[PDB]
putative glucoamylase (Bacteroides fragilis NCTC 9343), 422 residues
Amino acid sequence: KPSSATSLTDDALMDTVQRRTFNYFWDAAEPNSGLARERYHMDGEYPAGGPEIVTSGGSGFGIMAILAGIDRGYVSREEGLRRMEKIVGFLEKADRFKGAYPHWWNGETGHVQPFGQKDNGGDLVETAFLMQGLLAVHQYYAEGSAEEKKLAGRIDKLWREVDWNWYRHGGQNVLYWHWSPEYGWEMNFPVHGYNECLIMYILAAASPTHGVPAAVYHEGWAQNGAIVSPHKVEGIELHLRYQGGEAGPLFWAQYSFLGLDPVGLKDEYCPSYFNEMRNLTLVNREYCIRNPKHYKGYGPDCWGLTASYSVDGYAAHGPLERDDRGVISPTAALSSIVYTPDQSLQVMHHLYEMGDKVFGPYGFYDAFSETADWYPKRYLAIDQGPIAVMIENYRTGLLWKLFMSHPDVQNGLKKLGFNVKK
Ligand SMILES: [K+]
């Protein structure tokens, strides 16, 4: 029987979450650039950087959330195209470093906003998240209007300009995260797996202009098979060697899989990316259900530990006592809806039922601690984007279908030894 006291259906709940989370990128875009704000605080207080700072990677997630919105008629095609034109216009004029983008710009100036003294140039991980988004928009518009196709061409030129091979630091068989015109290679961070950065290696192999040999992946990312290290965490099998420990924060299951489709995905180092990321999600869920630190509210209907704002600032929360600060981040469980739908939907209903303190005007706020009575009315692009995109991927497979249709992406996957058997 229908009633005001009966719960939203899953579909109406997901619709509502998607509309609001889309509105984060649509209504709360930085007005000058059109890009995703790194952070947005309903309380108006910004102790560690303002809302005018725009994030390259977060904007990549956001443009995918916006694609989802165009496809559902949240906004018109025409409105959608005008936004894409604005975003691409900014990218064509903002600071770039060997065709890669910085982590942050000031949206009002187009100039790099450093994090700390030496990280004032290119960030290739962020570039990779931006490009994963941009290549999906290219495919959405490849057979569109003359105007949409024009925009797609401008994206293809940005894509072509990224010099992935530069970031090998003199032709080494690995990718470095950063490069600065001023400080060069001093950040010195070669990127080895497993962590959130797979899509970087895949896009580097995919580039039809400044692409890298397969050796860069096999030796650099996978370290000649060292990336394979089967072990159990919370009684659950993980196949991969996780950087810095036995597992990691849940976003590692998510960022590189917004456009790259994990379903039926395999390569030399993993017989199913889907199964691995599902199990990572289940390790996270299991730690929260066990709740060894006796935090309030953890359980089957409330789990999900990842990097986010935290009671004492910002922390890389994860399913290990050391990393558990009593803070649940909605993006963790919700962005894993593709891997664990029933379980992620249980969390989504339960969080929605907490009301205003957790579910705000642009969707779920970043993080909360029931134990600490800590409920910030604050958002981050990088936590918001994956909720909208992964809900869509579960519902229609939109972003996967678009990304995976890109002929360069296909060639990069073939070159690295990936196969898809669904
Ligand atoms: K109802």
